[PDB]
Amino acid sequence: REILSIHVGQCGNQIADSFWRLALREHGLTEAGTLKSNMEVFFHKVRDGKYVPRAVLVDLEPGVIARIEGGDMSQLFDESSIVRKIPGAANNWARGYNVEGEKVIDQIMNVIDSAVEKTKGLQGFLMTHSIGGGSGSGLGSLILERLRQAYPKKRIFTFSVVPSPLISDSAVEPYNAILTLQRILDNADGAVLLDNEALFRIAKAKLNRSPNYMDLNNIIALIVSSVTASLRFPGKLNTDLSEFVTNLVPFPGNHFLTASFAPMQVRTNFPDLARETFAQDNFTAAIDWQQGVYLAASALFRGDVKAKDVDENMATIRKSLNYASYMPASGGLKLGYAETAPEGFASSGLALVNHTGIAAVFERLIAQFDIMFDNHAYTHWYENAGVSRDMMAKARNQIATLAQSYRDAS
Amino acid sequence: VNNTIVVSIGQAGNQIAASFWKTVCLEHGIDPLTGQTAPGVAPRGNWSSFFSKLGESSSGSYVPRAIMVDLEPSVIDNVKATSGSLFNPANLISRTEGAGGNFAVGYLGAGREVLPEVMSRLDYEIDKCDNVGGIIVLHAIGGGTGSGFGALLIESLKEKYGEIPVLSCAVLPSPQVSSVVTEPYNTVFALNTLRRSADACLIFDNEALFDLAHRKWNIESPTVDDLNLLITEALAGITASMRFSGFLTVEITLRELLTNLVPQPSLHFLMCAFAPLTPPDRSKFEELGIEEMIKSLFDNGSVFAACSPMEGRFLSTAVLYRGIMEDKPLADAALAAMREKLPLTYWIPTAFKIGYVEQPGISHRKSMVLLANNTEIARVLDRICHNFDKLWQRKAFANWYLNEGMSEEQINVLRASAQELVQSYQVAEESGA
Amino acid sequence: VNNTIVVSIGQAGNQIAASFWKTVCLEHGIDPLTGQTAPGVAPRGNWSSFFSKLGESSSGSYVPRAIMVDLEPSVIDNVKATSGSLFNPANLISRTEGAGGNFAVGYLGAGREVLPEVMSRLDYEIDKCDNVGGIIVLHAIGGGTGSGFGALLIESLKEKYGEIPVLSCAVLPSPQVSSVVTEPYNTVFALNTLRRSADACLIFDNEALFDLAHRKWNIESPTVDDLNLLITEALAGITASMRFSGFLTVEITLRELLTNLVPQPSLHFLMCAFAPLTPPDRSKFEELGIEEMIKSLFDNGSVFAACSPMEGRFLSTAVLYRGIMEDKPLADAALAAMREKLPLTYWIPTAFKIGYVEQPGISHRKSMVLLANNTEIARVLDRICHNFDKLWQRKAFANWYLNEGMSEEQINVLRASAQELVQSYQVAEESGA
Amino acid sequence: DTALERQIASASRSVEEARRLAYHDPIRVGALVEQISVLADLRQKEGDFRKAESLYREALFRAQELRKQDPDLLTGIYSLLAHLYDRWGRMDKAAEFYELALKISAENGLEESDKVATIKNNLAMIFKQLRKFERAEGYYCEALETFQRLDGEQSARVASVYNNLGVLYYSHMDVDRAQVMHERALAIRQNLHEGQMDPADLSQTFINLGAVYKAAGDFQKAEACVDRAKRIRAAMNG
Ligand SMILES: Nc1nc2c(ncn2[C@@H]2O[C@H](COP(=O)(O)OP(=O)(O)O)[C@@H](O)[C@H]2O)c(=O)[nH]1
């Protein structure tokens, strides 16, 4: 039960600066990698003191890791657990998947394979990226293929960051989602879709300070950790990564999860954390609500959360929630616990929610794809770099199926 | 890091690049008159995007990846007097005769003579690069050298390499008065190249660059020392994502910039704008926030172009913030109002490629740069297409183009190839309406 | 915290405030020539009483809550040359013509012109304040601007707001020689305002401020650089309770100061004194203890006033200690001797409002400031009332007051309104005897 | 152990949380008000009106201390105190506090706001109880126009003011105008089926039309209305 991690793209590697500074805090390690709990999950025990993490910092535009391995964290990561190559998967899926992807994918896999042959209980892949760019979404789409083709019986959890519904942040970005959300739907066993519009808002209510993408990622980096902290801080109701596919993914397409965190050393009395965990504004996606009923919610409550309270709290929450008609009365919500909170908090909460609202994220990214693909509106950057319109409309016909697969799941 | 060559053709391109490498060297903490940095200490930012390590003593000169090409000697000899040992003087190529508003001297003539020597120095730069991912050719689209050899060089470089972006940061003819008598000729002869064999042609216009230094930088007579600083601060703004690896710097390569800004292969003429246009007199309590710089980005008299930008359709937009930002959600939400205010083109649902660079500008602390691929940029070239036709119904000047090797059949092709350019936004305006 | 605006009217008020914000910025560890603090570190004390956060980078400038108003341009242009980017230059209002000893130019004239612009900047400051609880107008009671517009502004500010103290820290005419020929006029025209529409008028006198820098700061010729530092160190002493939240700092607001010092609405002309008046030559072994500073507070030649303080009745007294004190019961027991020594006014049983501020002064470690609301302050204004009458039996100067809009009926009211002021201590002297 | 004591504990914690939040960040006053409204409701239900009043006064003091004055917030807070006074049976004070709310809005921009139209309606109702018909009519008409301009004519809030005017006219025996008002209310209320209007309001309109038609001497249409109200009240058992 030792989870490999992949951090592809500038969006993913910037989470890796947030995640491996929170994974070292929750396991109680210093920034160099030595000892200041199941530490075997994230960290490969190289020596008696030093714990090198099981992360590939796979990246094009090698200035992101120059921030990481320049300042304070060069001693932590192993440099045979990385790739840095120019050019930079030029916010272009076909650069990241085909042009500058095939240059690195032999090095990516043989660094993954040199990190999973050191294991001794490999279970998962917390592959962290965005579906927006060209490195996180292009090479992230390529790794998901090659990793499922190499490990077809291991759970591959994709921790994506959706393009914002607010504005673009990249011009060709609705192309890069559907070219990636295809390969997530085909290979990954469950994806957590996160949204920088919700990551702005929830961090805006968190801090008395206007956020930045280091502060946004600490919401993600807890969600990346809280999913896999019933796997390493065991407690009661041990929820491994195999139970986020059997419990939360009803149909073979509906595996795009909307995760919240609460509280947003911070203590919380916990009849209100469950009201904070399943707040509609605390879910980290712009999912639909007035035309949205859930499929399967989760609740990983970590720290000083005793299980008697959820018979009164969570049964009250699930009455307040909206599930599909084919989910039972008090059922439909799995639970879990950890015996150790994150450092800085005293009782946390997570909620992977599989919901029809995430199809509104899909319907946005198809309605943007609908105008933009038929008018060839950035298509020649894919065509002149390997990927034709046949390969791109076929990416739409799965996501248009997937946006229908939640509307079939109501 | 992604290396990038700044080729400087013509007098108008060199005098930008005279001031461009003044800026970029000062931006990296390098002396712009010696090429050497401060003694012992590394240059700030990522120097190797534009520069090269000359001498491994850590105090020696850093030669910029820049070839300065002009057929007149007086322009680069002005640069050699005002750069010292900064440039590589094997790259500072000059000739004697000049071109003089004749496209067919820079293209097929004295520029043909320098082309085995110019390309033998791009090959020197590119082989010296780690992996070069853009070539920023600075010229004008008005003269005989910058529009002549710039049309030659770019067609001699994508023909040779082809897997590299050519951002022709170029200066259009001002419509208020023509600085060359054959200036609506020489544009259309370069609009063959800058449409076909350049991946993007970043325009600038000397009328708008006068107004943005007179009304905005509050001086009486804006000289070409200050036209080549409005352009420079924009060219040192679009290349701050290329040169800086900072806190949360969105590292935008040229290809990474042009995939967001060239929608289909005939729509890559990009305008530009800069914010704040606060004068350098330290207007500290009048320094503009991010909610109001974007209000000053998109004024009609705020782009570096003769056209009126909000009177036509912004097809692809790339707002490159550069500097100290406190407000990320106040960022991009001002653009959310600007998604509603500005004429966009469905034909594209959304297009705002947003760069952040934490390394601030020299003149400004919170600086913003725009790159709007506008449909109005055919309306600049509608003037040039019309001023060509008034000088072709008469069959203007003389034999001057025709005696050098060009033909009347060829000139009518390049007018059509500029007509194919102007209609290519007219295709994209009403279909984008 | 209780914000407080320092409005600076006239040349005499500005040149105090030129030196006042030199002090206060140096007192808070802020550069008095840029407005920015030391980089990264917070300013000492509570900055926001007088200042404002301009730029949220923690190293940017702190604009003081200060509007500098004068009808002559040369005074504020001296300040703009000697402040840099410290003040907000929208608050540094100036005109061309000046007033020139004419009350009826600052009050009803060129000062009437600036009044829509001055009050549009007080409204900028007050809306920027958290909750403003005092306005310290610095002027003179001698000139045409400080005594003219200072009489206009204070009657234009309590008329607008009214729920705010106006401590007019003002400079009386020296009786040794008049610096203006119409100076006993201009006081009495301002003693309309500074009695009626100002909550207190802290006086200063240029004769006593010469003697307290010649005999006490042991220099030959005390310039106005050092008159505006004796005043300053007192104005930066009465405002140390407003600006500092320290160990056992008795935080005295202006209203908290004037409730202790204005007994009834026509007895609010306050003198002041400072201790120690040790020169800045580091007389370290001659630094004065608290038992002997109070012996030097209450000398006849120790107050900043032409009158002799111990020759008349101290009506309300406020001794503001400021600095490192070791001795709290040795404090207040020296004043117990001074309850016996000094002429007090039963009519009041006891009045010594005692401020402590642990944050020491710049020039002094153990500094003491006095504010004695004296009955002798009518004897300063008895001179001004007499010098008015000698210049009204003749009906002095000319039409100069009368042509601007004033009337002979109005001028006789304001002489009576200053006669009502002088008798208001003469009411309070013999009844307080 | 009682259900109400449980609701109070929960509402108190939630208020205490919003108080602390506004200690750390003094700007967050709006959220404190919301939490207070729930706790104040509960204190009213148990009859502790002085506690409820104290909560709203606290909200008010926080709003008053904002460096940027928020008149809309103050308007709302005063209207919550007004409503508190109304439920307490302090009818004069309720009118006084709604009037204060309106005065704050009139002095700033907020003449044509959602809150203001609501306040004018509620104030008109107090004036009806004070037996000041002309003042009641005036405010109801103003609330009516504002809701017309803000929402369509086709809205729940417009129909509610129509209804309230209807009852006003009916109570002063202006039967004709009562009829017009209740019919206009009926017209709107029929066209609005979902959770944007409960059916019990529709039954009130028939009930009110019934009394109006009966007063008009049309006993036929009266019984038809009283019938349709009975059908509605019956049909919400299922
Ligand atoms: N949550 C989060 N989102 C980011 C961060 N950096 C960038 N993004 C977003 O991720 C999206 C994709 O950019 P990215 O994948 O980094 O580009 P690429 O690495 O060149 O493929 C953009 O639309 C950004 O808004 C980050 O640090 N955290």
Ligand SMILES: Nc1nc2c(ncn2[C@@H]2O[C@H](COP(=O)(O)OP(=O)(O)O)[C@@H](O)[C@H]2O)c(=O)[nH]1
């Ligand atoms: N921005 C800018 N434009 C210039 C400058 N000098 C010349 N130009 C413009 O460049 C155009 C052509 O001049 P150029 O190409 O230098 O002529 P050539 O040297 O004969 O090719 C003219 O229309 C001028 O308006 C300059 O220093 N800055």
Ligand SMILES: Nc1nc2c(ncn2[C@@H]2O[C@H](COP(=O)(O)OP(=O)(O)O)[C@@H](O)[C@H]2O)c(=O)[nH]1
């Ligand atoms: N303490 C002090 N008093 C001054 C200074 N300059 C002028 N005064 C006094 O201020 C009085 C009036 O001058 P002022 O109001 O500046 O004239 P205005 O500018 O024409 O209104 C004169 O009697 C001077 O004695 C100074 O720098 N410090």
